[PDB]
Amino acid sequence: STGSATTTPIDSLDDAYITPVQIGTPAQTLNLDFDTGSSDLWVFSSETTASEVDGQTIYTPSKSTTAKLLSGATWSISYGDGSSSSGDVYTDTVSVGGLTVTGQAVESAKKVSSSFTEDSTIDGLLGLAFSTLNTVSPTQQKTFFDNAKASLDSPVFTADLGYHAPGTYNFGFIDTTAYTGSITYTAVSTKQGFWEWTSTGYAVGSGTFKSTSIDGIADTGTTLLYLPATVVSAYWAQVSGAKSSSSVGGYVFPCSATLPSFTFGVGSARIVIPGDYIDFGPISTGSSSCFGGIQSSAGIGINIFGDVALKAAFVVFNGATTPTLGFASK
Ligand SMILES: O=C(CN1CCCCC1)Nc1ccc2c(c1)OCO2
Numbered sequence: 001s002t003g004s005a006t007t008t009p010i011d012s013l014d015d016a017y018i019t020p021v022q023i024g025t026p027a028q029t030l031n032l033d034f035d036t037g038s039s040d041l042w043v044f045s046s047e048t049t050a051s052e053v054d055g056q057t058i059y060t061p062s063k064s065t066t067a068k069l070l071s072g073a074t075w076s077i078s079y080g081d082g083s084s085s086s087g088d089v090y091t092d093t094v095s096v097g098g099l100t101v102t103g104q105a106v107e108s109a110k111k112v113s114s115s116f117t118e119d120s121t122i123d124g125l126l127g128l129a130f131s132t133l134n135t136v137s138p139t140q141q142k143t144f145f146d147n148a149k150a151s152l153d154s155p156v157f158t159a160d161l162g163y164h165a166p167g168t169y170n171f172g173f174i175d176t177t178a179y180t181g182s183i184t185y186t187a188v189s190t191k192q193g194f195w196e197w198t199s200t201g202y203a204v205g206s207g208t209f210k211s212t213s214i215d216g217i218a219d220t221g222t223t224l225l226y227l228p229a230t231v232v233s234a235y236w237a238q239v240s241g242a243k244s245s246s247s248v249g250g251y252v253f254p255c256s257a258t259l260p261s262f263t264f265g266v267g268s269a270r271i272v273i274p275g276d277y278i279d280f281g282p283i284s285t286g287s288s289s290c291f292g293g294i295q296s297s298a299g300i301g302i303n304i305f306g307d308v309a310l311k312a313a314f315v316v317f318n319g320a321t322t323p324t325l326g327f328a329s330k
Pocket residue numbers: 037079080081082083219221222223300301302304
């Protein structure tokens with residue numbers, strides 16, 4: 001089997017991407033944030049504290065003839081950005097882009113943190129990291145991808161995120177029309193439960209490539225590109241007036257600037273992030289100070305190849321017995 005679904009930016013900055021997901025019988029369609037940095041499929045629901053729901057579409061398990069309470073199971077997740085959610089668990093039928101999994105754990109939120117409430121466009125998350133990170137207790141549950149894997153034509157999914165435009169998540173096949181040149185594959189460590197890999201270096205603008213190992217995660221659920229302070233300083237040094245602002249929480253730059261590109265290495269291959277992709281717009285409405293899309297990972301504990309990086313590529317998440325990642329230009 002295969003599936004194919006369009007993923008759409010939530011706003012004009014590509015702060016996140018939402019993908020429609022059918023849950024239950026009859027289907028209830030929720031727009032979920034596909035997150036290769038976590039492993040829980042959770043949704044706003046009829047059980048979510050009412051004051052914590054503000055415009056989201058909810059899953060109502062009592063209206064699904066295929067929903068079953070997973071007795072005794074609870075979940076609770078805290079994302080690295082400080083957001084969180086928790087609740088209980090149903091199994092139900094879940095379909096993405098025509099690919100159906102029966103008996104998928106659907107984690108129903110009883111509580112969500114303010115950042116989730118305040119984002120009316122995201123109805124929940126669909127985790128695509130390794131199932132070892134799943135938070136369901138006392139019996140850990142599998143991700144949608146792990147459940148689907150054995151049925152797929154090939155045990156892969158691909159992320160093709162758009163810049164200020166829709167893109168695609170495919171399951172079970174590699175669309176050879178969706179990228180240019182060849183896909184370069186690179187090793188993955190699953191030791192921390194992530195799609196963790198080592199970039200071979202970087203360049204800023206038209207500058208020389210610096211060969212250096214940068215260990216990080218391919219994370220569709222993180223907006224920005226978080227890299228070591230040395231790398232990030234080298235980038236922003238090429239932008240007149242750019243500075244790190246402790247009050248704002250990162251590098252800012254004059255909105256009048258033209259940003260240089262940023263290149264990262266994948267083996268001997270190179271992915272170029274255009275300068276425009278690194279502009280996250282005014283820090284507050286009307287400001288002439290703009291927020292940078294490349295930020296330091298110091299204090300995070302890991303480098304994160306978030307959407308800023310991934311959207312410049314066609315990305316293969318190869319879930320074969322020994323997982324790998326593939327990157328192609330597009
Ligand atoms: O928390 C995030 C992104 N966040 C995920 C949940 C939905 C809203 C966006 N990413 C992140 C990814 C890895 C990290 C980390 C943070 O801090 C430590 O490691």
